[PDB]
Design a protein around this ligand. Structure first.
Ligand SMILES: Nc1ncnc2c1ncn2[C@@H]1O[C@H](COP(=O)(O)OP(=O)(O)NP(=O)(O)O)[C@@H](O)[C@H]1O
Ligand SMILES: Nc1ncnc2c1ncn2[C@@H]1O[C@H](COP(=O)(O)OP(=O)(O)NP(=O)(O)O)[C@@H](O)[C@H]1O
Ligand SMILES: Nc1ncnc2c1ncn2[C@@H]1O[C@H](COP(=O)(O)OP(=O)(O)NP(=O)(O)O)[C@@H](O)[C@H]1O
Ligand SMILES: Nc1ncnc2c1ncn2[C@@H]1O[C@H](COP(=O)(O)OP(=O)(O)NP(=O)(O)O)[C@@H](O)[C@H]1O
Ligand SMILES: Nc1ncnc2c1ncn2[C@@H]1O[C@H](COP(=O)(O)OP(=O)(O)NP(=O)(O)O)[C@@H](O)[C@H]1O
Ligand SMILES: [Mg+2]
Ligand SMILES: [Mg+2]
Ligand SMILES: [Mg+2]
Ligand SMILES: [Mg+2]
Ligand SMILES: [Mg+2]
Lengths: 238, 235, 461, 469, 468
């Protein structure tokens, strides 16, 4: 379960050895960064780096995590802003979460669904009055820049205190100024004590931006499978 | 010394040439010159400045040991020359003694000076509404026709009283056209203060690649000796 | 020996190790019962295109050399049958029992082997026979958008021409297997089947068999020629054959070009369309004419395939989709269509009447955009000539009838014009025998006075 | 006599065998493994062979999630194509693409006969062709493009125009009372609709004469191709061995070809013009050449193709026109005018639009309507730039009528009752042919612009206008 | 030396010269083979070298359509490029690429004099500089874009615009009077026209003073490339040694470029731009600078150019535009308007439009007509929306006269008698300048526009109105 890295090109790496590695597995470099395997050729493995790759050199030791793409979940992440890999952002000590979920899990299918008859109280008049939403529905918010899309999501998430719905807010490729303005608004209004905020800024490598929504939904569905209601929002799919 | 392995379209790849520098001249047994432009691990890419039909695989290639050099001199004025230092009009040698490298560095910011002294061509529109100074670079962009060559001819002819050593270059053009332009200029005696560089279509494309570098190398000597120089490009 | 093994199989393309003496274009056989065609000879491997279903071949299969260039079996034993690109019958009804075969990669006949186009050919449609004439031996191109009135041209041409000593080959290419039946039966309804051959290569069959689909029919018409005949060949579409060639080339590891289409397309078409010839007196004096069909996306005539195709043919009939619904059938554009042979192969009655009528209709079309007393008369005459040229399906009009009404059209003689045509035909069919026989015999216009009294007598009635 | 896995690239697995045991095309491979150590994961997998690449290897496409495939594991070859139940036992049940039940109501034992999926198309001596009208009651469809029994009907539309609405309307109007066996293959649609129609069928009692298999969006690229084939292999048996007329409904068969584009780039093929696999035409032909009628029965299939954008020049939907017998096209630009269904009258055609099969009074009105609409389409630029008042009197009179015809093409569907204050209405063919005559001769043309919207027969128009004052 | 064929992919054949002596570039080589058994086909063919590789291997281009090529065949070197027969023996004959005759009048023996195709171009000190006006009778061409004698002339056109009718009018009018040796070379047109032209020549009597070369479309790129230079190889010997004037018509030289694309992908060159080979300029210049007039003799050359997609911003027309002395453009819009020929006056330009060559009586009238036809172009587009009387009457007069000016540009040709059914008419240049002066004078404001379609001398117009 040993090998060496021979290519470090542009955030993608190739590794020798790794006889027992499985597809979708987590990997750690000796530098202390997480990566993942997506392709296994005849004599090499392709690895995608999930952090700062400037510290990787040829011949570095690389190691097997031993499990599929699992992100921690639970009640201990409530009240924290976390990295998609499972690291707190604003400090406040390490997380205490024990249970984990693979973010690649098979979605529920036939004989596991039901119609929708109950509303998701948004409080924005023009939406609920004209374009109603219900729990289980997936509603696209799409449009032009500099028009106020995020101001809809913030109001919708503040209004959810009376319905007792744990929720997650996901920020992708976004500027930290707006991120911290939103976080300050939520902490002022108190939404952070039941919402979970995950961020992956524009100064972060592409793979984190690519994986962020998967973690954002994996840490959200866990409360569903225990009977609770959940609302999840993504900042930008583009 | 090394051997040639691949030949085609005027491009060659050779094996050998251990100490060949980038831009170094190389020669073959046939006498045609070549320039090294790519340096790989086991082969060197040679780009040939002349007719290549006679080169064969297995021919020997010799390193010249020098960078591109272009001879310059005041006596060259009037003569029509190739982008390389060879006579094209005949009439004996080129009458030059000093040679300049083509890789001269551009002047620094502290070696320059503001410009307020003009250049003239004799046209009411260009000489006034889009003025040009004696230190300015000005762009002419257009399709075929519309009279772009007339601007160059007026810029060269009108510089009679005001001293300006001029270099007109015609790149990749048919030789009949350049001869017609030369004769039209000859009717006004412009050959007393003008130098012409021509590389015809039949000539290999490397000469077209090298032409404007010579059109500035031949013109900077009068500058660095203290004379005013104009350079014009046909295309 | 001339044996080999296959070490790569996929999508009907195989790579063979061995087969030293295999020639280009040679057939090579598998143990499964399906043949293959060589198109590439690398240093150590051979590129084989499989000529049928490919579910049976496996790596390690032995493959044997046969020793012969591309063939098609031909003869009079095939008239009336429906056959594949190869000689295997489609409709069953036993084997065809041919003896001789032609090597259809043969050289096209050259210069001094050819003569000028001379004998007229007719489809029975006033729109085609009059304004944009066709001569026997010409290659005339039909290009257009999908579902705009194409196949009717060929079917009505074959239906009308049953009166002659001619031989016709019709090919349906890349179409759904059952699509041909509505054609095959409709011929039999009017009896046109009893002197033709139909070749089909369905989408069920592999794409490579489309790439040979138009090659074989011209070879059948070729073998019927070299004796004094008049032969027609029709390919219902070539664009799918171009796509089949593209997708055949791609898996062979050959780099692409201007599109997904490879750059050899012109060469391919030059190999095909030039196979026709109007041979001279010292050669046999036959005639092999073709009517290719080409489809383009959104009717873009400026695309790669349309412009490539136009450069070879002796003309083009452009079918425009936006005139199709307006009520001009067939929707032939009188301005854009061109025919290169012109008045070389045409009966001399039409020269005296409507030799230049096409320029008149083009001028009327040009003036329409400006018009949206001389101009008024020009507009009236143009509207009437547009009105006259219309025809319906499976109701052809013989060549002897067109000139008589064109004379009235082009000598200054709108709601009821179309029925005026039919009633005039009735009036002639009952009285104008003395003109009709002369038109049949001498191929020149009879006395103008008699035609004038006949026309004026009708108009008075 | 067993296989191995050495290379994994996502949807593609590069299995390897030994000499003499090479599988054939479309053969099925099975992989089973149980955890030897706590670091491993348990997954049962099945694969479909597609290419042979020498050196004792074959390419295969995965049928399920390929996560956790450790290299060096064992592979089992069945030696036969994928086998799916067919016959009487499959009525009322629901299966996945692999053929197992997913309705959880019970199992289906081995005594039910099951056939291979892939078989060659019928020979020319077995095919048959006849033309006769299939009726739906839709005004816009039944006139300008009547359907043919045993033929192919194609639906074309962008990313949301009402394709599924039309499919469900046709099912509600035909499939229950046609008297034939019905099959609905849920190829690539939303899972919500897939589990909604299951309730819609069971609670209505029609499920006793229907068969379904699902392949919805969540499934890996290998599964999304074969849903149509698994749906068709049942309609084939219902047509042939039981002599029953069969209706087949497919919603997103385009997701077939797109799936190929996902896997081809991993198989190792050169790319096409826009990156497609260089097998689009041949594979689509091999798909649609089996949906045929015979001398023993007729199969009528209504299908819809997903157009990747508002551009019909794309090769994947453009090459569909080689097989359709009736065409219906949708576009956003007419949907946004407030007219439903937004079928374009100048691009939907059918082979059944002939004068010996529909009568003079039908062909005449169809041609008249198309001719009248062409002029209004042509006047578009000039009426848009400067106005409808510019044109002459004879053109102004023509302008007065085309929009009313387009409004009269609208009709309230039965599934639109939840969005509209009226339920779905029915207009027979004899009525839809009659209706346009009144407007064409000016019997009812003087009514206002909006009265012809969302109407049934021509009599309802006048009473709606009276209700408007 | 001896070689063995090792790879074949159709247009490109890869041979190995193990003998230790390697043929040079552009050397022709031959293959001959007789069948070992009744399955093989006897073959005899030449091929042309175009590359080298480092295993004594040579790549060759195919100039004949071939099937049945086998591995292991033997190849023999010739040691010289393609040789074309020149001198007295060449007159009144039709040849192929390798020099053999095409017609059935008989063989040509081995004592004839032959010239190699490829030579270096002439130099700067020997090219002619003086030019003169050449009269053809074509109304538009003789006025707005005169063909300077001794220069290069280009006919630019799209698909089916009308190039060939004009080019055959030119060879009918000029070669019948001009005593120069005439060479017509076809590079990319249809075989039927080429076979018809030989019979028309055998009737015209020009066959005594003319030679022809063919091969046309039904052959791979190798022949379509060299068929252009074969006729130039003849004209070169006629100019350099015998010294008489020469006419050189060359037909669709575009296919010299296009052919080079098709082999390029197999020769190891990368694609470029639209898809043309990277050596466009280098390959084309070695041809366009060979056809020149010298101090020893004057060469007058006409060429046909086909625009690849009816659009001029294409690298092939862009590269071709740099060598012509006078170009006439053809727009398919004019082809559809029914006013032939389809020469667009706006983009047609020539070096002759100088005061010292055509005189002052030419320049003012030509400039006024050109400027009026430029001015009408935008007003006619404004008319399409703004109406027909909202524009002022003075503006409408521009249309009222430009319509007549454009219509009078049409001419009834003599070689179009098949398509027209009319014998035509003849005009000298004096009558052309004279007639344009009258049409601008206002003498013909009341004659209908349609009367000006397909007429020659202005004197005919008043007759046609008399006919109406
Ligand atoms: N409903 C609203 N009423 C009043 N002001 C508003 C409203 N929504 C937003 N604003 C103001 O407009 C600004 C823009 O809103 P914001 O939500 O940041 O846009 P945005 O969605 O982030 N644009 P973008 O970053 O391109 O996605 C906010 O910071 C507010 O000051
Ligand atoms: N002021 C002018 N008045 C009239 N004609 C002019 C004028 N200036 C230039 N010309 C014309 O310019 C022509 C010379 O060709 P020209 O248009 O200059 O070629 P060019 O494409 O613009 N430059 P080049 O690329 O070298 O050919 C002559 O025929 C002149 O008539
Ligand atoms: N002269 C005509 N008058 C009226 N309708 C016609 C005429 N010719 C053809 N049609 C119509 O054309 C329809 C068939 O369409 P058509 O365009 O011929 O098929 P197609 O495009 O040739 N299909 P394909 O076989 O792939 O070429 C018939 O149903 C007729 O209604
Ligand atoms: N009669 C009608 N009146 C008004 N709106 C309608 C009517 N019929 C359909 N629609 C609208 O058309 C939309 C499209 O329906 P739907 O079938 O869900 O989308 P789609 O076209 O199938 N896209 P998809 O199924 O994802 O390929 C619906 O959401 C309705 O809003
Ligand atoms: N004066 C004329 N009157 C009427 N028709 C004409 C006239 N001149 C030419 N044409 C037509 O225009 C066609 C042009 O033929 P041709 O010149 O071969 O096309 P092209 O321009 O050469 N395109 P290509 O041959 O493919 O390079 C002729 O075949 C005639 O049909
Ligand atoms: Mg924002
Ligand atoms: Mg110039
Ligand atoms: Mg058809
Ligand atoms: Mg839907
Ligand atoms: Mg031509």
């Amino acid at each position: 379960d040993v090998g060496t890295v021979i290519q470090v090109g542009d955030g993608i790496a190739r590794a020798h050895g790794l006889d027992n590695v499985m597809s979708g597995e987590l990997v750690e470099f000796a530098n202390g960064v997480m990566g993942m395997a997506l392709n296994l050729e005849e004599n090499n493995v392709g690895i995608v780096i999930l952090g700062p790759y400037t510290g990787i050199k040829e011949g570095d030791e690389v190691r097997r995590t031993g499990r599929i793409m699992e992100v921690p979940v639970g009640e201990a992440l409530i009240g924290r802003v976390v990295n998609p890999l499972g690291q707190p952002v604003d400090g406040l000590g390490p997380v205490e979460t024990t249970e984990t979920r693979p973010i690649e899990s098979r979605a529920p299918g036939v004989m596991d669904r039901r119609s929708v008859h109950e509303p998701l109280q948004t409080g924005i008049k023009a939406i609920d009055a004209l374009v109603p939403i219900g729990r289980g529905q997936r509603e696209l918010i799409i449009g032009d820049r500099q028009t106020g899309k995020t101001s809809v999501a913030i109001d919708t998430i503040i209004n959810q205190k009376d319905q007792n719905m744990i929720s997650i807010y996901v920020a992708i490729g976004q500027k930290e100024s707006t991120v911290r303005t939103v976080v300050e608004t939520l902490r002022k209004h108190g939404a952070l004590d039941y919402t979970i905020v995950v961020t992956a800024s524009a100064s972060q490598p592409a793979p984190l931006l690519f994986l962020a929504p998967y973690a954002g939904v994996a840490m959200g569905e866990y409360f569903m499978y225990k009977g609770k209601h959940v609302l999840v929002v993504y900042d930008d799919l583009s | 010394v090394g051997t040639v392995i691949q030949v085609g379209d005027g491009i060659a790849r050779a094996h050998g040439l251990d100490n060949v520098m980038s831009g170094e001249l190389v020669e073959f047994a046939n006498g045609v010159m070549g320039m090294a432009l790519n340096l790989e691990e086991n082969n060197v890419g040679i780009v040939i400045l002349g007719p290549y039909t006679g080169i064969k695989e297995g021919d020997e290639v010799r390193r010249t040991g020098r960078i591109m050099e272009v001879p310059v001199g005041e006596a060259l004025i009037g003569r029509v020359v190739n982008p390389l230092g060879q006579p094209v009009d005949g009439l004996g040698p080129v009458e030059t003694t000093e040679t300049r490298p083509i890789e001269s560095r551009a002047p620094g910011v502290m070696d320059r000076r503001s410009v307020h002294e003009p250049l003239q061509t004799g046209i009411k529109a260009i000489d006034a509404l889009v003025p040009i100074g004696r230190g300015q670079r000005e762009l002419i962009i257009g399709d075929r026709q519309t009279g772009k060559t007339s601007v160059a001819i007026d810029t060269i002819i009108n510089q009679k009283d005001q001293n300006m050593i001029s270099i007109y270059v015609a790149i990749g053009q048919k030789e009949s056209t350049v001869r017609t332009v030369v004769e039209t200029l000859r009717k006004h005696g412009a050959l007393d203060y003008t130098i012409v560089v021509t590389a015809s279509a039949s000539q290999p494309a490397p000469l077209l690649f090298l032409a404007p570098y010579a059109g500035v190398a031949m013109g900077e000597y009068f500058m660095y000796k203290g004379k005013h120089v104009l350079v014009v490009y046909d295309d | 020996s001339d044996v080999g093994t296959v070490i790569q199989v996929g999508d009907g393309i195989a790579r063979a190790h061995g087969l030293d003496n295999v020639m280009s274009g040679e057939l090579v056989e598998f143990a499964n019962g399906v043949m293959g065609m060589a198109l590439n000879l690398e240093e150590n491997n051979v590129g084989i295109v499989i000529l049928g279903p490919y579910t049976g071949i496996k790596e390690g299969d032995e493959v044997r050399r046969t020793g012969r260039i591309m063939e098609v079996p031909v003869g009079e034993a095939l008239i009336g049958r429906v056959v594949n690109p190869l000689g295997q019958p489609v409709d069953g009804l036993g084997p065809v029992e041919t003896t001789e075969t032609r090597p259809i990669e043969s050289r096209a006949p050259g210069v001094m082997d050819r003569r000028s186009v001379h004998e007229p050919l007719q489809t029975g449609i006033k729109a085609i026979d009059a304004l944009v004439p066709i001569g026997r031996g010409q290659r005339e191109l039909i290009i257009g958008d999908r579902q705009t009135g194409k196949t009717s041209v060929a079917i009505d041409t074959i239906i009308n021409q049953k009166d002659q000593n001619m031989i016709s080959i019709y090919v349906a290419i890349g179409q759904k297997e059952s699509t041909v039946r509505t054609v095959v039966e409709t011929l039999r309804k009017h009896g046109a089947l009893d002197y033709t051959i139909v070749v089909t290569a369905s989408a069920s069959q592999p794409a490579p068999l489309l790439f040979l689909a138009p090659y074989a029919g011209v070879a059948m018409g070729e073998y019927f020629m070299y004796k004094g005949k008049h032969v027609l060949v029709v390919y219902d579409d070539l664009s799918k054959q171009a796509a089949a060639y593209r997708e055949l080339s791609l898996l062979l590891r050959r780099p692409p070009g201007r599109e997904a289409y490879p750059g050899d397309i012109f060469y391919l078409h030059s190999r095909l369309l030039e196979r026709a010839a109007k041979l001279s007196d010292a050669k046999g004096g036959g005639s092999l004419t073709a009517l290719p069909f080409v489809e383009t996306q959104a009717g873009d005539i400026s695309a790669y395939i349309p412009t490539n195709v136009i450069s070879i043919t002796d003309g083009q009939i452009f079918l425009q989709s936006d005139l199709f619904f307006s009520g001009v059938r067939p929707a032939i554009n009188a301005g854009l269509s061109v025919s290169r042979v012109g008045g070389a192969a045409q009966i001399k009655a039409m020269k005296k009447v409507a030799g230049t009528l096409r320029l008149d209709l083009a001028a009327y079309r040009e003036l329409e955009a400006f018009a949206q007393k001389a101009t008024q008369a020009k507009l009236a005459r143009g509207a009437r000539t547009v009105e006259v040229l219309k025809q319906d399906l499976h109701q052809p009009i013989p060549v002897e009838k067109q000139v008589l009404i064109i004379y009235a059209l082009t000598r200054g003689f709108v709601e009821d014009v179309r029925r005026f045509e039919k009633e005039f035909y009735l009036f002639l069919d009952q009285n104008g025998q003395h003109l009709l026989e002369h038109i049949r015999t001498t191929k020149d216009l009879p006395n103008e006075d008699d035609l004038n009294k006949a026309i004026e007598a009708f108009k008075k009635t | 006599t067993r296989g191995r896995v050495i290379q994994v690239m996502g949807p593609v697995v590069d299995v390897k065998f030994e000499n003499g045991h090479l599988p054939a095309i479309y053969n099925a491979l099975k992989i089973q493994h149980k955890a030897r150590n706590e670091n491993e994961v348990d997954i049962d997998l099945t694969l479909e062979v597609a290419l042979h690449l020498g050196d004792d290897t074959v390419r295969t496409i995965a049928m399920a999630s390929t996560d956790g495939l450790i290299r060096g594991m064992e592979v089992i070859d069945t030696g036969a194509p994928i086998s799916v139940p067919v016959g009487e036992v499959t009525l009322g049940r629901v299966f996945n693409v692999l053929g197992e039940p997913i309705d959880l109501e019970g199992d289906i034992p081995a005594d039910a006969r099951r056939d291979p999926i892939h078989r060659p198309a019928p020979k020319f001596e077995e095919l048959a062709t006849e033309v006769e009208i299939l009726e739906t009651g839709i005004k816009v469809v039944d006139l300008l493009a009547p359907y043919i029994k045993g033929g192919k009907i194609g639906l074309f539309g962008g990313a949301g125009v009402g394709k599924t609405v039309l499919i469900q309307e046709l099912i509600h109007n035909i499939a229950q009372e046609h008297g034939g066996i019905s099959v609905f293959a849920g190829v690539g649609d939303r899972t919500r609709e897939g589990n909604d129609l299951y309730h819609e069928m069971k609670d209505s009692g029609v499920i006793s004469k229907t068969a379904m298999v699902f392949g919805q969006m969540n499934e890996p690229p290998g599964a999304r191709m074969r849903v149509a084939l698994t749906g068709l292999t049942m309609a084939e048996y219902f047509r042939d061995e039981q002599g029953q007329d069969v209706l087949l409904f497919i919603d997103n068969i385009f997701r077939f070809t797109q799936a190929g584009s996902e896997v081809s780039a991993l198989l190792g093929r050169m790319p096409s013009a826009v990156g497609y696999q260089p097998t689009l035409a041949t594979e689509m032909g091999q798909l649609q050449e089996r949906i045929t009628s015979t001398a023993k029965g007729s199969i009528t299939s209504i299908q819809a193709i997903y157009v990747p954008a508002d551009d019909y020049t794309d090769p994947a939907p453009a090459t569909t026109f080689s097989h359709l017998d009736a065409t219906t096209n949708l576009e956003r630009k007419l949907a946004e005018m407030g007219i439903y269904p937004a079928v374009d009258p100048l691009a939907s055609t059918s082979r059944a639009l002939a004068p010996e099969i529909v009568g003079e009074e039908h062909y005449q009105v169809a041609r008249k309507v198309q001719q009248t609409l062409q002029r209004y389409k042509e006047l578009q630029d000039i009426i848009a730039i400067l106005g409808m008042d510019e044109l002459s009197d004879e053109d102004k009179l023509v302008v007065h009528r085309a929009r009313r015809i387009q409004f009269f093409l609208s009709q309230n569907f039965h599934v639109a009752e939840q969005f509209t204050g009226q339920p779905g209405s029915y207009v027979p063919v004899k009525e839809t042919v009659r209706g346009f005559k009144e407007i064409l001769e000016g019997k009812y043309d003087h009514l206002p612009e909006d009265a012809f919207r969302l109407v049934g027969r021509i009599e309802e128009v006048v009473e709606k206008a009276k209700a408007m004052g």
